[PDB]
Design an enzyme around this catalytic site. Structure first.
Site, mmCIF file in Angstrom:
data_model
loop_
_atom_site.group_PDB
_atom_site.id
_atom_site.type_symbol
_atom_site.label_atom_id
_atom_site.label_comp_id
_atom_site.label_asym_id
_atom_site.label_seq_id
_atom_site.Cartn_x
_atom_site.Cartn_y
_atom_site.Cartn_z
ATOM 1 N N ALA A 84 44.363 31.615 45.782
ATOM 2 C CA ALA A 84 45.758 32.036 45.680
ATOM 3 C C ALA A 84 46.248 32.511 47.042
ATOM 4 C CB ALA A 84 45.898 33.139 44.645
ATOM 5 N N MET A 85 47.574 32.628 47.231
ATOM 6 C CA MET A 85 48.025 33.314 48.452
ATOM 7 C C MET A 85 49.251 34.155 48.124
ATOM 8 S SD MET A 85 48.656 34.018 52.026
ATOM 9 C CE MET A 85 49.739 32.827 52.839
ATOM 10 N N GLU A 86 49.276 35.330 48.731
ATOM 11 C CA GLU A 86 50.045 36.530 48.496
ATOM 12 C C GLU A 86 51.410 36.564 49.152
ATOM 13 O OE1 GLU A 86 48.415 39.249 51.577
ATOM 14 O OE2 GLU A 86 46.633 38.053 51.638
ATOM 15 N N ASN A 87 52.023 35.412 49.482
ATOM 16 C CA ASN A 87 53.284 35.427 50.231
ATOM 17 C C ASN A 87 54.269 36.368 49.532
ATOM 18 O OD1 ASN A 87 52.433 32.605 51.560
ATOM 19 N ND2 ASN A 87 52.582 32.281 49.320
ATOM 20 N N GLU A 135 41.786 42.479 52.859
ATOM 21 C CA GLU A 135 41.071 41.803 51.790
ATOM 22 C C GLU A 135 40.146 42.762 51.051
ATOM 23 O OE1 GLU A 135 42.972 37.932 52.533
ATOM 24 O OE2 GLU A 135 42.332 39.247 50.874
ATOM 25 N N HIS A 184 44.524 40.799 42.196
ATOM 26 C CA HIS A 184 44.294 40.764 43.645
ATOM 27 C C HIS A 184 45.575 40.437 44.402
ATOM 28 C CE1 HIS A 184 41.373 39.505 47.069
ATOM 29 N NE2 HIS A 184 42.590 39.375 47.562
ATOM 30 N N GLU A 185 46.239 39.349 44.019
ATOM 31 C CA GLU A 185 47.419 38.957 44.746
ATOM 32 C C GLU A 185 48.462 40.086 44.694
ATOM 33 O OE1 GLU A 185 45.467 36.420 46.093
ATOM 34 O OE2 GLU A 185 47.448 36.457 47.101
ATOM 35 N N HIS A 204 48.040 42.728 47.090
ATOM 36 C CA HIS A 204 48.327 42.368 48.470
ATOM 37 C C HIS A 204 49.749 42.794 48.875
ATOM 38 C CE1 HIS A 204 44.876 40.526 50.202
ATOM 39 N NE2 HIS A 204 44.817 39.517 49.361
#
Ligand SMILES: *[C@@H]1O[C@H](CO)[C@@H](O[C@@H]2O[C@H](CO)[C@@H](O[C@@H]3O[C@H](CO)[C@@H](O)[C@H](O[C@H]4O[C@H](CO)[C@@H](O)[C@H](O)[C@@H]4O)[C@@H]3O)[C@H](O)[C@H]2NC(C)=O)[C@H](O)[C@H]1NC(C)=O
Ligand SMILES: *[C@@H]1O[C@H](CO)[C@@H](O[C@@H]2O[C@H](CO)[C@@H](O[C@@H]3O[C@H](CO[C@H]4O[C@H](CO)[C@@H](O)[C@H](O)[C@@H]4O)[C@@H](O)[C@H](O)[C@@H]3O)[C@H](O)[C@H]2NC(C)=O)[C@H](O)[C@H]1NC(C)=O
Ligand code: 62S
Ligand SMILES: *[C@@H]1O[C@H](CO)[C@@H](O[C@@H]2O[C@H](CO)[C@@H](O[C@@H]3O[C@H](CO)[C@@H](O)[C@H](O)[C@@H]3O)[C@H](O)[C@H]2NC(C)=O)[C@H](O)[C@H]1NC(C)=O
Ligand SMILES: *[C@@H]1O[C@H](CO)[C@@H](O[C@@H]2O[C@H](CO)[C@@H](O)[C@H](O)[C@H]2NC(C)=O)[C@H](O)[C@H]1NC(C)=O
Ligand code: NAG
Ligand code: NAG
Ligand code: NAG
Ligand code: NAG
Ligand code: ZN
Length: 911
Positions: free
Chosen positions: A286-289, A344, A321-322, A325
């Site tokens: 995943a990514m937290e943008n 992280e 988690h995301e 962030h």
């Protein structure tokens, strides 16, 4: 002007250093992106409002694989660059991913300028930059979307920019779309303007200050589900249209989680919206943008007919988690990649506390110790690293996303919390996050804020913190504060993990060592690697006589404590909350094993999983003989804490798969027998249903897979029936999710099931169901089939390329495939580079996925050779040495305890 690097066109590049200059500071980006999803093109333009701290002639930025068409410079403070400004000359120096713009006259301190460029490129065919993604509909149509993934340093592949995390700016993004699509980006859409031809222009709200790597924008087809939080954030879950069914739990869990985080951090989420979107083609998990968080469909989408409870626990942890962030990583970004653990490790740690807060039912607290154990194996090797450590090139930065920054960072945090208490730990993180909001922090910054945590609301009169008293406590609070900041910093800068040795006298001598595996104490290089290592370990211990936990910091290599009631045994590291391993000398290990076989309930259940891990790891250390760790598993038949039972069995199952790979068919037949016979009661209690609670369910899948992996005649029979019913009912019947994967791999064992399984992989609409299916396919015993699977993943048209890494790893796991995977990797190493980065997780996993299980002197030589061949071609990764230490440690373990294992198993036959 000679030792200077040369740009393309042949000129002297003004800068020549890997970082950028801190003289032109970006303040605000105006970004206009116009992608064509038929051309697979993009045309774009940008105006950066910059500030100059020091007089310059030359502007340095990052750009990569972008054709810049036009370069100007304007100002409203410096008259000379008055409207319409002046044209700039552009010099490109690809080797450092830097772009240099030269101005005709030096610029002025404290005066803001506007840099404008027109640039263009193709949408990537990789997993980074502004790339192309593709999905299958339920009708069988194929659609495209355009998506961004920039962390850590690929922002510069989409637009020129100051691609370093400290260069925080506001971003104002306009995006142009056909009526067929929608466009998403970090912030809410304020306007959509009809354009002449028929296209539309989406203007998004200008962002807050944030690092480049978080910028996001998407053009696509998707549908959404909305809800509001108690704070009034509009949360939306996006997916392809036919998959909006599966999008419902992601919305329910993210609402509860964003709620938990806001109250826990005492900081509201600052944007008006938050979006979670399931990207079909997604390399990271995943990514937290900020406000536009991207996932793999497996990370975010849950379907109830085909996802297991363990699947649910995974989907809920990534969301956890995301979302963590948005504060750790977006609200507060680390100063530089060297302290990436600041993002992280903290995010990973909040998965624990928040999932435990909002979904206790998922029983995640009991599985968090697994996070620590997984890194401890790597931190027992000398190829490890300290948590913070320098990094400069794009490949090194990628390397920093490992078990160290993530898991170790979280385990030292969890250790520190046990020290201070939730109340002091919370108030410390709220002070950190409020103080560094919208700017960066370095490693030392954090320990100060956690060390100076104020236990409660600042009691103005007469307090211990602020507004006013001077007492003896005040010299101890101030004094204990610098005790904790000194302690944590050595965990942060010392690679490795300590071993506390405890000798029980009449009334406890303590020694501290660097834990090490492979290497034995007598070995020539054991005293060489114990150099200079020392930790301020916050110990704990409880005794046979009382439940009272005593806490004793230790700041020296030797120390000794006086035991009052002189009880039967002592147990250090209570609940394993501390990042260290305890080894007891002289009938103290024997003392504790005695307890486990009589009343095992006189040790709390984390102590039992803690010992089980420590016991076996000390066999790896040579400080213990294998007969002792196997003597402990005797008690497991009475074991009731499912975590300790599965920790125990896991080791035993470890051994069986090790023997099986090396063809040692005496031991891996008695291992088969010892499991099936000694654990027969617990296996036969299991349903072939979804009937229980989460640890019931999670324990059912575990054991049944164990039994069917040992060809236990009955369980293979029940699974093959269930598979046949499902196949002969053309999918009209359903299989319980817990045994879904077991059934599929049973079916895969004939060509009929295998071929049906592959053909029904292409038509599934549940990517959980696919993931289970592809595993089952990977258990074929015919090398003809495995090779197809791998080739299909190279191709990427049927089995998507974001799976070729984990596929190879799966094939390699099992004996019939550990070679074919190894042969493939060495025969196509150059092809595999043209699809993934050398520092990608896909490569690090492809490499150790197929080598790290090797355990013979003969295989090591091949690998060392292959690695040398690679370093010879300019490829270097830390993973290389790590594998070799791991493979080495395997050889020594077999050399030292294979006879003992063989002999122990025959001895059990006799009783
Ligand atoms: C990405 O590029 C694609 C093409 O690769 C592009 O799709 C094309 O867009 C153009 C522009 O809108 C379309 O061309 C027009 O089609 C309409 C019919 O749909 C015609 O009427 C147009 O001719 C008249 O248009 C004006 C009135 O609007 C008149 O004043 C003029 O004098 C003409 O008589 C013109 O042919 C073309 O049909 C599509 N291609 C298709 C549908 O296959 C797409 O828009 C681009 N996307 C983005 C986001 O830029
Ligand atoms: C770049 O990002 C920065 C964030 O990192 C932005 O800084 C923020 O800017 C806003 C606007 O200037 C500041 O907001 C403050 O809010 C209070 C409350 O507003 C009151 O008035 C409105 C109008 O009716 C009302 O709706 C409210 O409820 C209040 O009654 C104002 O009184 C303040 O004057 C100020 O405007 C933020 O404090 C500020 N934060 C930070 C960290 O700097 C910056 O705006 C962004 N730049 C651009 C160009 O968008
Ligand atoms: N399957 C994994 O563990 C992958 C491995 C991986 C892949 C690529 C980079 C780094 C790690 N982890 C992720 O994709 C990560 C971390 C993570 C852990 C978990 C997780 C969730 C549930 C239960 C267990 C879990 O472990 N979910 O995500 C998402 P991130 O939030 O940190 C994001 N900013 C990463 C950015 C990045 C992108 C490209 C290169 C380098 C960094
Ligand atoms: C291993 O040790 C545990 C102790 O933690 C044993 O369980 C405990 O046994 C005692 C003896 O019965 C219990 O004491 C109490 O006695 C009174 C007297 O009538 C009674 O009213 C109480 O309800 C209780 O029985 C003690 O509470 C009990 N603990 C628990 C949680 O039940 C255990 O039985 C030992 N091992 C085996 C195999 O029995
Ligand atoms: C996981 O959640 C539970 C929630 O109950 C935590 O246990 C409670 O913690 C509070 C402190 O907030 C104590 O006062 C209660 O007595 C505890 N109750 C129970 C039933 O245990 C637990 O500490 C959480 N774990 C973590 C790591 O946060
Ligand atoms: C540049 O910044 C430095 C910071 O040390 C300062 O000393 C100097 O005066 C500034 N100007 C120039 C022209 O170097
Ligand atoms: C610079 O931008 C303008 C505006 O689009 C364009 O007309 C011009 O062709 C561009 N570059 C030149 C002339 O070099
Ligand atoms: C999507 O949602 C509705 C909800 O009731 C359901 O009836 C419909 O069948 C679903 N479609 C699929 C394919 O799951
Ligand atoms: C251990 O690591 C250190 C630090 O990088 C290095 O100097 C040494 O060569 C390594 N030794 C072994 C045996 O791995
Ligand atoms: Zn993360």
């Amino acid at each position: 002007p000679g030792a200077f690097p040369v740009a393309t066109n042949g000129e002297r590049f003004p800068w020549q250093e890997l970082r950028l200059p801190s003289v032109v500071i970006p303040l605000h980006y105006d970004l206009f992106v116009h992608p064509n999803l038929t051309s697979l093109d993009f045309v774009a333009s940008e105006k950066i409002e910059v500030l100059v701290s020091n007089a310059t002639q030359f502007i340095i930025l990052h750009s990569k694989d972008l054709e810049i068409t036009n370069a100007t410079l304007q100002s409203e403070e410096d008259s000379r660059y008055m409207k319409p400004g002046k044209e700039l000359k552009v010099l490109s120096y690809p080797a450092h991913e830097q772009i240099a713009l030269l101005v005709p006259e030096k610029l002025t301190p404290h005066l803001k300028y506007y840099v404008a460029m027109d640039f263009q490129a193709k949408l990537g065919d990789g997993f980074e930059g502004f790339y192309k993604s593709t999905y299958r509909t339920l009708g069988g149509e194929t659609r495209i979307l355009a998506v961004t993934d920039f962390e850590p340093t690929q922002a510069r592949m989409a637009f020129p920019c100051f691609d370093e995390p400290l260069f925080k700016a506001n971003f104002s993004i306009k995006i142009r779309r056909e009526s067929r699509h929608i466009a998403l980006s970090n912030m809410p859409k304020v306007k959509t303007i009809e354009l002449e031809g028929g296209l539309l222009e989406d203007h998004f709200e200008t962002t807050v200050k944030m690092s480049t790597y978080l910028v996001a924008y998407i053009v696509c087809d998707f549908h959404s589900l909305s809800g509001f939080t108690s704070s009034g954030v509009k949360v939306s879950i996006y997916a392809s249209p036919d998959k909006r069914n599966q999008t419902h739990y992601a919305l329910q869990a993210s609402l509860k989680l964003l709620d938990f985080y806001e109250k826990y951090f005492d900081i509201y989420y600052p944007l008006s919206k938050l979006d979670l979107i399931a990207i079909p083609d997604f390399a990271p998990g995943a990514m937290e943008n900020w406000g536009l968080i991207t996932y793999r469909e497996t990370s975010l989408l849950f379907d109830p007919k085909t996802s297991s409870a363990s699947d649910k626990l995974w989907v809920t942890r990534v969301i956890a988690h995301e979302l963590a962030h948005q504060w750790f990583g977006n609200l507060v970004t680390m100063e530089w990649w060297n302290d990436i653990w600041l993002n992280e490790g903290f995010a990973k740690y909040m998965e624990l506390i928040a999932v435990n807060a909002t979904y206790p039912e998922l029983q995640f607290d009991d599985y968090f110790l697994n996070v620590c154990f997984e890194v401890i194996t790597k931190d027992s090797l000398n190829s490890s690293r300290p948590i913070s450590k320098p990094a400069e090139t794009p490949t090194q930065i990628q390397e920093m996303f490992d078990e160290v920054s993530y898991n170790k960072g979280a385990c030292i945090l969890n250790m520190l919390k046990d020290f201070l208490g939730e109340e002091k730990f919370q108030k410390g993180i709220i002070q950190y996050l409020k103080k560094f909001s919208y700017r960066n922090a370095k490693n030392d910054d954090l320990w100060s804020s956690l060390s100076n945590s104020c236990l409660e609301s600042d009691f103005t009169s007469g307090g211990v913190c602020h507004s006013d008293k001077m007492t003896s406590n005040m010299l101890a609070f101030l004094g204990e504060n610098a005790e904790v900041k000194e302690m944590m910093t050595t965990w942060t800068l010392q690679k490795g993990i300590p071993l506390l040795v405890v000798k029980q006298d009449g009334c406890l001598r303590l020694q501290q060592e660097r834990f090490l595996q492979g290497v034995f104490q007598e070995d020539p290089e054991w005293r060489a690697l114990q150099e200079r290592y020392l930790w301020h370990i916050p110990l704990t211990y409880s005794t046979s006589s009382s439940n009272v936990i005593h806490r004793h910091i230790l700041k020296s290599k030797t120390d000794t404590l006086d035991l009052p009631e002189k009880t039967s045994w002592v147990k250090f590291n209570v609940d394993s909350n501390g990042y260290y391993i305890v080894h007891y000398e002289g009938h103290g290990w024997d003392q504790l094993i005695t307890q486990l076989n009589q009343n095992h309930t006189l040790l709390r259940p984390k102590d039992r999983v803690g010992l089980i891990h420590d016991v076996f790891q000390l066999v790896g250390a040579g400080r213990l003989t294998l007969d002792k760790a196997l003597d402990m598993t005797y008690y497991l038949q009475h074991e009731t804490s499912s975590p300790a039972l599965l920790e125990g069995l896991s080791y035993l199952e470890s051994f069986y798969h090790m023997m099986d790979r090396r063809n040692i068919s005496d031991i891996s037949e008695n291992l088969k027998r010892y499991l099936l016979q000694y654990f027969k009661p617990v296996i036969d209690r299991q349903s072939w249903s979804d009937k229980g609670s989460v640890w019931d369910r999670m324990l059912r899948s575990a054991l049944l897979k164990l039994a069917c992996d040992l060809n236990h005649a009955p369980c293979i029979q029940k699974a093959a029936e269930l598979f046949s019913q499902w196949m002969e009912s053309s999918g009209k019947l359903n299989i319980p999710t817990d045994v879904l994967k077991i059934v599929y791999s049973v079916g895969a064992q004939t060509t009929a099931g295998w071929n049906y399984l592959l053909e029904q992989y292409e038509l599934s609409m549940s990517s959980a169901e696919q993931n289970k299916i592809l595993y089952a396919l990977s258990t074929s015993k015919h090398q003809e089939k495995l090779l197809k699977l791998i080739e299909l993943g190279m191709e990427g048209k049927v089995i998507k390329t974001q799976n070729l890494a984990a596929l190879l790893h799966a094939i390699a796991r099992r004996p019939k495939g550990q070679q074919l995977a190894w042969d493939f990797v060495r025969e196509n190493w150059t092809h595999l580079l043209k699809k993934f980065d050398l520092g990608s997780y896909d490569i690090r996993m492809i490499i150790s996925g197929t080598t790290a299980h090797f355990s013979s002197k003969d295989k090591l030589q091949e690998v060392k050779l292959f690695f040398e061949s690679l370093e010879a071609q300019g490829s270097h990764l830390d993973i290389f040495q790590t594998v070799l230490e791991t493979i080495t440690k395997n050889i020594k373990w077999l050399e030292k305890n294979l006879p003992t294992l063989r002999t122990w198993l025959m001895v059990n036959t006799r009783h």
